[PDB]
Design goal:
2 chains, 4-stranded antiparallel β-sheet, part of a larger assembly, Influenza hemagglutinin, 14 strands, about 160 residues, mainly beta, Hemagglutinin HA1, Antibody, immune system
Chain lengths: ~160, ~55
């Protein structure tokens, strides 16, 4: 019923000691490489990837939809040049949610000119609950979250029909 | 434990997660922990993941 888009982790200030200019040739946009406007690809800056920690609080009085990703390079060479650490992890924990993403590195077939894999994830943060992101690499940072109000009882209709 | 009671037994257990590496060495004296709860038709290995939570 009601739904707004707001920047949960500002692109300019959330990551001072990181690189947020990462772009994928797979996510093209008019002859230029790019990436998800709502996500962010965080790679190492100045040759180090510090242990990050971000705590967002849901003061909006509505359910917040924060989505993030977990990256998987195809080999151990891509892991040391983007994040400077073989053994990686991501700690995305809240008051009523917890998960530890152990990055598994393997050479995979070429899907869309890519041997890498960005496994995405999404959680809902209830009001009065604080979510915490913690990582030392391979974290696709959330940039644009959403605050929504639930419409129960609907679905999705596949259709080519025109609108009127 | 063996189920000689001739009925289904409901055994419940827990797995603890301290907030930091300091609580892990003073309660259990080992950083790397695990729990092996295995039976004839059930198996699981709980790798304790330590993190600061709200």
């Amino acid at each position: 019923s009601s739904f707004e888009r707001f920047e949960i982790f500002p692109k300019e200030s959330s990551w001072p000691n990181h690189t947020t200019t990462g772009v994928s040739a797979s996510c093209s946009h008019n002859g230029e490489s790019s990436f998800y406007k709502n996500l962010l690809w965080l790679t190492g800056k100045n040759g180090l990837y510090p242990n990050l920690s971000k705590s967002y609080a849901n003061n909006k009085e509505k359910e917040v939809l924060v989505l993030w990703g977990v990256h998987h390079p195809p080999n151990i060479g891509d892991q040391r040049a983007l994040y400077h650490k073989e053994n990686a992890y991501v700690s995305v924990v809240s008051s009523h949610y917890s998960r530890k993403f152990t990055p598994e590195i393997a050479k995979r077939p070429k899907v869309r000119d890519q041997e890498g894999r960005i496994n995405y994830y999404w959680t809902l943060l209830e009001p009065g609950d604080t979510i915490i992101f913690e990582a030392n690499g391979n974290l696709i940072a959330p940039r644009y979250a959403f605050a929504l109000s639930r419409g129960f009882g609907s679905g999705i209709i596949n259709s080519n029909a025109p609108m009127d």
